[PDB]
Structures are given as C-alpha cells and as structure tokens.
Amino acid sequence: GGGTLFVTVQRCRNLKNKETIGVSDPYVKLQLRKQTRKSPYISSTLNPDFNFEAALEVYDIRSDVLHISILDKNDLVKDRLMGTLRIMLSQVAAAPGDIIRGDMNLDPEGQISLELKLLRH
Ligand SMILES: [Ca+2]
Ligand SMILES: [Ca+2]
Ligand SMILES: [Cl-]
Ligand SMILES: [Cl-]
Ligand SMILES: [Cl-]
Ligand SMILES: [Cl-]
Ligand code: NA
C-alpha cells in the first residue's frame, strides 16, 4: 500500500440525539492507525453541515481502515458517541478514479455525506 487519503465530511442527517437536556452538539472524529483528527463542533443540531476537510496517511492500502465517529461535544461530562462508520481503504482503492462520494448509513442511525479520495504513492 501507501498513499494519502483525503476525507471530506460534508454533512450529517438524522443523527441520534444523545444530550441529557437539549440537543447534541456534533463533531467528527477520524482515526487511522495512530492518526486522529477532530472537527470543530456545531451547536444544537442533529443535521450538521460540517464541510470538514482532513488528510490521513495510508500505510497499507489492502488492510488499513478509517474509523469515523460523530460525537456530542459536552463541557462537564464525557463526550457521547452518536454514530460510527468504518471505511476499508481497499474499497477506496477499488473505486473508479480512487474516489468514493455518497451518502452512507451510520451505525446505528443517521446518514453521512462524504467524499474519500486516495492518492497512491
Ligand atoms: Ca447542546
Ligand atoms: Ca453536548
Ligand atoms: Cl490500526
Ligand atoms: Cl470547536
Ligand atoms: Cl488533516
Ligand atoms: Cl460501519
Ligand atoms: Na460531498
């Protein structure tokens, strides 16, 4: 393998509310091997428009996995998990143009609009 994965999270829709009182304040967390990224949060919404851009280095295209989490930012208690999605880098590498772009289903509910572009080295 070996490449750079460009990730754009455009938005999420229909997220599961996790806030004890009020509406959750979502942000994106990305993880690939030892790399982590976190977007700024958006207050009081289950339908955030993030337009979040990141890049992660890929060390083995065949086996690497990108882990996406959507979390509720909290000030006093632990941030709570709203939804997750795993992307296998092999799926990106198989796609025409090494590009994937669509509205995907989060676990356990909600949708996420993403663009994933792999540049191979
Ligand atoms: Ca809130
Ligand atoms: Ca919160
Ligand atoms: Cl890993
Ligand atoms: Cl922020
Ligand atoms: Cl980044
Ligand atoms: Cl998943
Ligand atoms: Na998009």
Numbering used by the authors: 474 to 594
Sentences from the paper on this structure:
The structure was solved to 1.5 Å resolution using the selenium single-wavelength anomalous diffraction de novo phasing method. There are two molecules per asymmetric unit, both of which contain aa474-594 of TbE-Syt. The structure showed that TbE-Syt-C2B adopts a type II topology, consisting of eight β strands that form two sheets and a short α helix in the loop connecting β6 and β7. Additionally, there are two tightly bound Ca2+ ions, which are coordinated by a few charged residues in two extended loops on the opposite end from the helix. The interaction is mediated by a network of hydrogen bonds between the Ca2+ ions and the side-chain oxygens of residues E492, D498, D545, and N547, which are all highly conserved in trypanosomes. The main-chain carboxyl oxygens of residues V496 and K546 also form hydrogen bonds with either of the two Ca2+ ions. Similar to the Ca2+-binding site in the C2A domain of HsE-Syt2, TbE-Syt-C2B also has an extremely acidic “crater” on its surface. In the TbE-Syt-C2B structure there is also a basic patch on β2 and β3, which contains residues K502 and K511 at its center. Our structure-based mutagenesis studies revealed that TbE-Syt-C2B bound lipids in both Ca2+- and PI(4,5)P2-dependent manners via an acidic patch and an extended basic patch, respectively. Superimposing TbE-Syt-C2B onto each of the three C2 domains of HsE-Syt2 showed that it is very similar to HsE-Syt2-C2A and C2B, with average RMSDs of 1.05 Å and 0.75 Å, respectively, but substantially deviated from C2C, with an RMSD of 3.57 Å.
Extended synaptotagmins (E-Syts) localize at membrane contact sites between the endoplasmic reticulum (ER) and the plasma membrane to mediate inter-membrane lipid transfer and control plasma membrane lipid homeostasis. All known E-Syts contain an N-terminal transmembrane (TM) hairpin, a central synaptotagmin-like mitochondrial lipid-binding protein (SMP) domain, and three or five C2 domains at their C termini. Here we report an uncharacterized E-Syt from the protist parasite Trypanosoma brucei, namely, TbE-Syt. TbE-Syt contains only two C2 domains (C2A and C2B), making it the shortest E-Syt known by now.
